[PDB]
Amino acid sequence: PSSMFFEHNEALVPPYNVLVDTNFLSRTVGAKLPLLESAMDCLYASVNIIITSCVMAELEKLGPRYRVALMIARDERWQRLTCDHKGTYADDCIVDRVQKHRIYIVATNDRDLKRRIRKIPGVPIMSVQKGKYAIERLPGA
Amino acid sequence: GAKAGKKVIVEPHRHKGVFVARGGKEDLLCTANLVPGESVYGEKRISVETPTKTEYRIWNPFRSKLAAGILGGLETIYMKPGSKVLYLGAASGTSVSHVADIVGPTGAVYAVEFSHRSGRDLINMATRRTNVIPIVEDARKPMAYRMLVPMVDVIFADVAQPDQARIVGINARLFLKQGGGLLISIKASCIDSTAPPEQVFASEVQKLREDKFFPKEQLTLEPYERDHAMVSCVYLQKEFEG
Amino acid sequence: RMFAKPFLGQLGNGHVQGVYSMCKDKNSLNCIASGSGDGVVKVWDLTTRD
Amino acid sequence: AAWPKAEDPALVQELLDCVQQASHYRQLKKGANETTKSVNRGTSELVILAADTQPLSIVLHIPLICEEKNVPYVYVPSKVALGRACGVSRAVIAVSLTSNEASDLNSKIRALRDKVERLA
Amino acid sequence: ELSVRVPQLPGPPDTLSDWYNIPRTNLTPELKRDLQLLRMRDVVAMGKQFFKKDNRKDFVPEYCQVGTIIAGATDGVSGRLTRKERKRTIVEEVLSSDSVSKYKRKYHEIQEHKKSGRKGYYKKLMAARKR
Amino acid sequence: PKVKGRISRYLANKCSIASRIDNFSEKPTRHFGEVLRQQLEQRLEWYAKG
Amino acid sequence: MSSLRHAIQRRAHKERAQPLERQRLGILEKKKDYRLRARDYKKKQAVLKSLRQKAAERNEDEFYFGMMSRKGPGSALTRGKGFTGTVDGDRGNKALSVETVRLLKTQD
Amino acid sequence: IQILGAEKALFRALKTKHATPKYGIIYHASLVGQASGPNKGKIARQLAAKIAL
Amino acid sequence: PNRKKEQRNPRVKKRKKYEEKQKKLRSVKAVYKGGEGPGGYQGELSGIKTNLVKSVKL
Amino acid sequence: KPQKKETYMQKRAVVVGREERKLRDLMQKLTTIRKEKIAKRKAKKEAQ
């Protein structure tokens, strides 16, 4: 892709587009951390934070015990990429979108998705670490 | 380089209607000329002595974004010979002459331009070629040429306006068949002069999916034009034709 | 019983909290409004549900 | 005939300051023929034409290739001020200031062409 | 107004209708040499310009037509071959070009390397043993 | 020599000027070409000064 | 390891040559040349052993149809002096009818 | 007189041992125009001989 | 053990390594490298392959 | 077996002129250099 110098993604500039995974969202509202504010404190930069219909569908498929996380997810000031695919499998949706464009920072916490996107080059991973967020492979932070 | 007088041979390219002319020390791209013997903008043309009236015109990729995309390796271009093509941003009709030659005598090419002097050049080109019809009107207001343009199968877009996605949105909402192919040429420096190019292309593709297409391909035609991208999508379907 | 597929769509991104009231325009055909629980009301047109 | 005429309030002066900056940075081309050749080669990032030239057909032919190749072109109404801004000690009527891969002049160009695309 | 008809009832297509009727290849041996040259043009420009390695099983296409560049109206003093260089075949142009001595030199180097020790060397050793 | 190349480049410049004037006028005039031909004759006298 | 030796440890050992009083007999065969010879001779012996197995396990009553459309190896007795065990292969030339020879001779 | 006009093809075919052309301008003569194929060739020979006479 | 002058001057090493890693970049993707030359269009100077698509499939 | 008597086709074969012998020699040289080049390229790629 354009703006890619040997697994250094020159395309990501503040404002950072950060994709959310269901696991990262549930665990951050559990660890009582403001999502945009803590992400901005972790990256020192302006972020727009996006959530897909697949992630929203998995939070809704989970029962009413996650009503608080569903409300925080549907906080209005965040963009929503609607998806054009069938299975509503959020891991494959995120990996397909990232392989297509490769600008976002994936924010996830489960080791399977973490390895699956460490395989592809040039995508930073944000993960919760019980005090704050921690960004993995971003060269500028 | 490809000096005038060198002998080349002409093979058909994978797309229906474009030929690749290979020979000697340079291989180039060409389309079948509709009116023989008369160049449009001073381009080199190839003559073939069939065992006269048949000649090809050399397509300058640095000057035409469509030729740049086809050398960049588009999967398809949707414009078979005989398929109506609405061309938005038909400034002076160079690439429009090439597209009219690709479409051929049985189809049509609807060249929509806006500037009047480029319009004069386009009028000359359309007097020469009988399958292109010219329309001098602002592409943002398709209610002007809704009386002229019928249901085309391909929409080319070569406008660099900040309202590019909305322009192609209304023009496709009014003049594009079910499952209608389109190509758009996106210039990052004009879409968002502050932003990086990959993010600009992602934003424009998302705006098109809001405007009801479905993107099937996107390439960065890098060795011919800096910070460009050609995005191929289909209108309101997943396959192209039906 | 094979072709019973009744679910069509979801009107945009929905609300933050729950949908507790809604009403249609008995004069029109594609005008609907829904008032949520946090105190936001939204007016949707049914032709474009984005 | 010069419908993208730049207005008085300080847009003309931002244009002239940017032209002088580009002349110092050597990222600038002066003269009608050199503007024509730079636009044909496609290096032109922006182009400014005088509006008070002896007959306007010259800086009328430049917008033809300018519109054919889609570059932002403006008219400034003072060729002597254009020459004094380019630093020529002679009157220019056509200036094409080009693009490099790295400067801050490129950022000034981006802001300026955003303004003139709003003008058009 | 209405005449008797004439009954004219007594594989691969001749003309590609979808590409404006390009004729089938009349495989003259000059055309075969030209197609060998076009598959071989990584060697013709010796080292100075490389090409994308397009190598199929058959190097003849199914549809071709030999042509000539006519003219560029913008370039006509150096972008135009003289009359004494307008050759009929591409391989005639290549032989009339330069570096044919370079081809011959490289060919002699490869010939020496391949006749390195094959049989003349062994005949030499056998004579030096028998003497 | 060099005078032929000099006057040829000069004549090409004046020719392009005449072309753009006579094309981009609506109904063109003659005195601009008369002034240009006068400049050509004065350059002819200038090269005669040699 | 590999960083636990000096460059003088890494220094290559030179290969001696044939003595000059014996250079006429050819090159001095060292280990690499010997391996070349062993591979070549073992390969040829392998193929010859497989052919011997085949000639031993030949059924004497086989019948293909190349036996109807070829000219078998025969024996030394039948083939005469020019007898190699191989079957003669078709050079492609053939017998030409009189009409075609008339046409070719008219052109000549 | 049969192969007047077809000299290029004639001499190329003779120097390459190809088959010589059958006729020349006698083709665009009228009387051979009624035939087709081999009868056209035979009329070409006979018309050449009678034209010489 | 013996080293190079490129290793003896730490700026030159990061000049020679960068220029070499810039050269590898042109061998995988493509760089713009100026538009059409001043001579005009002399054909797509290195080959045109028909059966190759290079678009990012969305 | 290599034939020894000259066939009638070999006798009636035409002699070939200077331009065609030049082109044949050129094709021989170009084909040989192509073969050695493609062999070296395949060997290096096998090593990688």
Ligand SMILES: [Zn+2]
């Ligand atoms: Zn999805």
